Amino acid sequence: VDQATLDKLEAGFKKLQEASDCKSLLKKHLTKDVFDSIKNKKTGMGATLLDVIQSGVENLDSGVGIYAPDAESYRTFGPLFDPIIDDYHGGFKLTDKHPPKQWGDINTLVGLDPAGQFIISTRVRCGRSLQGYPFNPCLTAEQYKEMEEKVSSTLSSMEDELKGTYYPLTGMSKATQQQLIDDHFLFKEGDRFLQTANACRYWPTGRGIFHNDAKTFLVWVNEEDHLRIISMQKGGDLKTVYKRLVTAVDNIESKLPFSHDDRFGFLTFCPTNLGTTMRASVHIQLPKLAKDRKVLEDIASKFNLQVRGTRGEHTESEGGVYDISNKRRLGLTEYQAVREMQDGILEMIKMEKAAA
Numbered sequence: 470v471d472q473a474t475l476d477k478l479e480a481g482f483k484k485l486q487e488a489s490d491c492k493s494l495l496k497k498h499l500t501k502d503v504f505d506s507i508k509n510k511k512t513g514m515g516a517t518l519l520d521v522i523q524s525g526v527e528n529l530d531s532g533v534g535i536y537a538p539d540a541e542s543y544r545t546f547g548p549l550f551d552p553i554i555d556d557y558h559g560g561f562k563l564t565d566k567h568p569p570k571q572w573g574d575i576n577t578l579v580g581l582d583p584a585g586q587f588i589i590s591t592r593v594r595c596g597r598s599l600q601g602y603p604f605n606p607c608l609t610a611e612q613y614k615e616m617e618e619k620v621s622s623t624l625s626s627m628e629d630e631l632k633g634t635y636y637p638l639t640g641m642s643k644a645t646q647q648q649l650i651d652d653h654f655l656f657k658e659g660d661r662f663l664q665t666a667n668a669c670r671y672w673p674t675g676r677g678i679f680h681n682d683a684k685t686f687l688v689w690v691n692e693e694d695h696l697r698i699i700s701m702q703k704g705g706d707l708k709t710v711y712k713r714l715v716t717a718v719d720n721i722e723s724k725l726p727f728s729h730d731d732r733f734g735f736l737t738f739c740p741t742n743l744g745t746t747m748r749a750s751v752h753i754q755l756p757k758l759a760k761d762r763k764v765l766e767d768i769a770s771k772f773n774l775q776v777r778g779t780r781g782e783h784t785e786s787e788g789g790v791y792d793i794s795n796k797r798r799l800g801l802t803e804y805q806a807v808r809e810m811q812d813g814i815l816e817m818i819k820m821e822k823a824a825a
């Protein structure tokens with residue numbers, strides 16, 4: 470590695486050490502021992518430890534703080550990724566391997582809130598990376614366009630309920646983009662954690678969103694991951710939402726070659742999205758349990774769930790509406806992932822009803 474990067478790396482390590490109240494997994498697991506063992510390493514694509522931890526160093530408020538510039542990074546800088554992946558996903562040893570794709574018995578999934586007084590909307594998303602293309606930090610403006618064309622073309626073949634239209638971000642009016650974001654359909658623009666990881670270069674080139682007219686099935690093109698396949702709708706009908714997702718993913722995979730790893734399952738940009746790459750969530754109101762957010766988050770964590778704001782991660786809840794989802798994605802099947810959300814949410818609703 471060049472000495473400039475080495476100097477930047479030494480500076481970053483010091484910044485992490487000096488940040489006493491920093492609670493990121495990067496700071497926690499990047500011991501001097503680990504640091505020294507991989508700071509001089511570089512991947513075939515020229516990715517260094519700096520490309521990996523840069524976001525965490527610049528954004529000390531990061532929960533994780535690292536990203537994989539390319540697939541090789543997960544192993545080249547394994548001494549750092551491994552303990553962090555093990556920590557975040559609730560246990561994943563060096564000898565562990567992510568299980569084969571398994572949607573499970575969808576008929577065992579249920580309506581999460583029949584009376585409809587708590588859940589506002591249910592959503593399930595997956596992420597996929599195109600074989601042949603590296604993660605954001607190593608992509609050229611031309612590659613973004615290539616990927617956009619391949620994906621949009623493929624999605625033009627979607628039929629029936631999944632039939633839709635691709636809407637490029639480039640050329641999209643400001644009003645439409647903002648409405649799509651406010652409506653919780655489109656990804657947000659200008660994420661500080663992604664920017665510092667150099668994952669937003671050439672924006673908004675090659676970026677866009679595909680969605681059926683109903684906006685129940687959507688596909689994000691070139692945001693954090695090459696693709697984010699989404700299924701969502703008002704209410705708490707998890708069975709229908711999940712089934713739609715399964716249908717879409719199965720079909721898209723028969724057309725597009727996605728990167729899958731023997732140990733990490735489906736590959737993604739952030740280590741938190743590996744394996745199933747699944748995040749099943751609900752926008753829900755729990756006034757009693759939410760009153761003291763400490764207890765809300767403490768209760769959720771026991772069910773392996775994560776709490777996010779109404780507009781997504783790093784945001785606050787608006788009007789008492791929280792985003793609650795399964796935190797774990799690696800080391801468990803797609804079925805187990807969606808089940809953790811279903812099981813936890815059903816219980817949290819029971820607790821809310823019984824709360825004083």
Ligand SMILES: Nc1ncnc2c1ncn2[C@@H]1O[C@H](COP(=O)(O)OP(=O)(O)O)[C@@H](O)[C@H]1O
Pocket residue numbers: 590591592594650652653654655656701748750751752777779780781782792
């Ligand atoms: N159950 C839900 N209902 C409606 N919108 C949701 C729901 N869950 C997440 N979202 C929306 O998904 C968008 C992306 O949020 P984010 O936290 O980045 O999740 P991810 O990238 O994993 O999909 C946001 O606009 C957020 O409001």
Ligand SMILES: NC(=[NH2+])NCCC[C@H](N)C(=O)O
Pocket residue numbers: 524530531532533534535662693739741742782
């Ligand atoms: N990957 C993702 N969208 N969210 C989890 C990590 C977010 C950010 N890097 C951090 O807080 O570390």
Ligand SMILES: [Mg+2]
Pocket residue numbers: 693781
């Ligand atoms: Mg996101």
